[PDB]
Amino acid sequence: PAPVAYPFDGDPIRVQLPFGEPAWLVTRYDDARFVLTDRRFSRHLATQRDEPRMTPRAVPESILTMDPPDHTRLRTLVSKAFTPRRIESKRAWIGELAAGLVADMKAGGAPAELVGSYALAIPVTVICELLGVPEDDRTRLRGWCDAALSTGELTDEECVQSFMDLQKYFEDLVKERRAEPRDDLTSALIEARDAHDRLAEPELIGLCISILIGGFETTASEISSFVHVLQQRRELWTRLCADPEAIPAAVEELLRFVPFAANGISPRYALEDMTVGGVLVREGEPVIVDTSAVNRDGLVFDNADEVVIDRADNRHMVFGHGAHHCLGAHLARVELQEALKALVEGMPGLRLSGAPRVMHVEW
Ligand code: HEM
Ligand SMILES: [Cl-]
Ligand SMILES: [Cl-]
Ligand SMILES: [Mg+2]
Ligand SMILES: [Mg+2]
Ligand SMILES: [Mg+2]
Numbered sequence: 001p002a003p004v005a006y007p008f009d010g011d012p013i014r015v016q017l018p019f020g021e022p023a024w025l026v027t028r029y030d031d032a033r034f035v036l037t038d039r040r041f042s043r044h045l046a047t048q049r050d051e052p053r054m055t056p057r058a059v060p061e062s063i064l065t066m067d068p069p070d071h072t073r074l075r076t077l078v079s080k081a082f083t084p085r086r087i088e089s090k091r092a093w094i095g096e097l098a099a100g101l102v103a104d105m106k107a108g109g110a111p112a113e114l115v116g117s118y119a120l121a122i123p124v125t126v127i128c129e130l131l132g133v134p135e136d137d138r139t140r141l142r143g144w145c146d147a148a149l150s151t152g153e154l155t156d157e158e159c160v161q162s163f164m165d166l167q168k169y170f171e172d173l174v175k176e177r178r179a180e181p182r183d184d185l186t187s188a189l190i191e192a193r194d195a196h197d198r199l200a201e202p203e204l205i206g207l208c209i210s211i212l213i214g215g216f217e218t219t220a221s222e223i224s225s226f227v228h229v230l231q232q233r234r235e236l237w238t239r240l241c242a243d244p245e246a247i248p249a250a251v252e253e254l255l256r257f258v259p260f261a262a263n264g265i266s267p268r269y270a271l272e273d274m275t276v277g278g279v280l281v282r283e284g285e286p287v288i289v290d291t292s293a294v295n296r297d298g299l300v301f302d303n304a305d306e307v308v309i310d311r312a313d314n315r316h317m318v319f320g321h322g323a324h325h326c327l328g329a330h331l332a333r334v335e336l337q338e339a340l341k342a343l344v345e346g347m348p349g350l351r352l353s354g355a356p357r358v359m360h361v362e363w
Helices: 029-037 044-050 069-081 084-088 091-108 115-120 121-131 136-147 156-179 185-191 201-232 234-242 244-258 327-344
Strands: 013-016 025-026 268-269 274-276 279-281 285-290 359-360
Touching: 013 327, 025 121, 029 201, 029 274, 069 201, 069 327, 084 327, 091 115, 091 327, 115 121, 115 201, 115 244, 115 327, 115 359, 121 136, 121 201, 121 327, 136 156, 156 185, 156 201, 156 279, 185 201, 201 244, 201 327, 234 244, 234 359, 244 327
Parallel strands: 025 285
Antiparallel strands: 013 025, 268 285, 274 279
């Protein structure tokens, strides 16, 4: 087919992202399950092909560009450190943090700018605390944080200097924690072993960066979009004010419902010619799962285009599937649950004044 421009039956669609080669776009859940689970699809060809992507720089090698067995080694090592216990043990604290940020907005008076004061504030502080970045070094991360969230108007060179600054900073942090270990994720990653296997210094630095960048904008955008969606369907906001125990269910359903601009899921490359949902995918061609479409696939989700908080069997793909399923999924869930909880408890009368980049709120 002639490719169509992406971002903008059920058969895969030929698309052209802003950069890279043309790709097949998968919109059906059943098709996506194959693409993301099966060992006949590869990520590591990313770095030998011209990867469909939103930004011009060729993609750096990372945990997200690996295939089993190299990938499995990395995930095994990371799972020794990034454990569900280490995550849950932070829930109360994340809750206190969230409550404190709501109280800070209150003390400043309406209107507050929710993106900057809340949606961005929670994940950057949570990730930093987890990683062990001290408060008096967090200024080093601000450049990236601006680069991730903006258009206005960082230079090409400021972006690359701010990303290299992440490398430089995390190199220092990894050296410091190797020499003086602490109770943080960075030290636990350095200490992780699987027999004699361990993460090399460049792998540690890369993982710290992958954690920060995987957790920051994603979590931030979802907090902002959750609040937007709940405010436009205010009957749902009110329900959560009346029934804060429904928040975990509501987080799952908002994760399903909130549409991604681009592909949150990275391209997978066919290792041999295969038909997927009726189209021939050639050896070496990329296939992109559209998270938003798959999460609205009416063959799987009844009333897919409505928000149904208590939806039974809400097995969405917002965190992907298969081997590369979001390392941070549990942490993200904790952050989103506690973010919504603090807002509905602290500001049940919240309304919009004028994901979003800026979003002003009164109460
Ligand atoms: C709402 C928040 C989040 C969303 C929607 C999200 C989404 C995703 C998705 C879709 C993937 C798979 C990409 C693919 O297979 O191509 C992924 C992977 C990843 N996520 Fe997240 N994520 C979120 C939060 C986090 C957090 C808080 C962290 C870290 C603490 C994190 C770290 C990562 C990492 C390291 C990977 C790569 C895993 C691998 O390749 O094995 N994410 N995430
Ligand atoms: Cl042929
Ligand atoms: Cl999941
Ligand atoms: Mg299979
Ligand atoms: Mg140094
Ligand atoms: Mg109850």
